[PDB]
Design a protein around this ligand. Sequence first.
Ligand SMILES: CC(=O)N[C@@H]1[C@@H](O)[C@@H](O)[C@@H](CO)O[C@@H]1O
Ligand SMILES: [Ca+2]
Ligand SMILES: [Ca+2]
Ligand SMILES: [Ca+2]
Length: 129
Amino acid sequence: CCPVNWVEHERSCYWFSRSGKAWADADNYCRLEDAHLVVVTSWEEQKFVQHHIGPVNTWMGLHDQNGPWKWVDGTDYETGFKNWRPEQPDDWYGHGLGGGEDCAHFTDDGRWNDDVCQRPYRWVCETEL
Ligand SMILES: CC(=O)N[C@@H]1[C@@H](O)[C@@H](O)[C@@H](CO)O[C@@H]1O
Ligand SMILES: [Ca+2]
Ligand SMILES: [Ca+2]
Ligand SMILES: [Ca+2]
């Protein structure tokens, strides 16, 4: 029951961009498709997303812009699945662009990193059947 060009996996529909956007723009894009930036809650979902994105930095629906880490659909962060690269998240200021790092993304090996929300990365939308 997914729209055309979306991939079905375990009762969810996924859309994989092939262009980049800043996190806020990617978030708005997903909402306009009645969807949300991907929310990863299991190792099997993590492996499925990794297969389709390949070795490319790609935004997910996890951020700490207003305080603590939150998933865009209200899924609890603390008790949920996490796949940070060791030493991440680190809220790095050293990029010199202003502020720390408030948006999560998959890195080239699948492990997560927090980075500057303005960066243009590919993104994934998800909707639940
Ligand atoms: C893309 C990526 O992994 N970026 C990270 C950045 O977010 C920050 O953690 C930095 C710390 O030295 O290490 C990397 O450059
Ligand atoms: Ca999900
Ligand atoms: Ca942060
Ligand atoms: Ca980081």
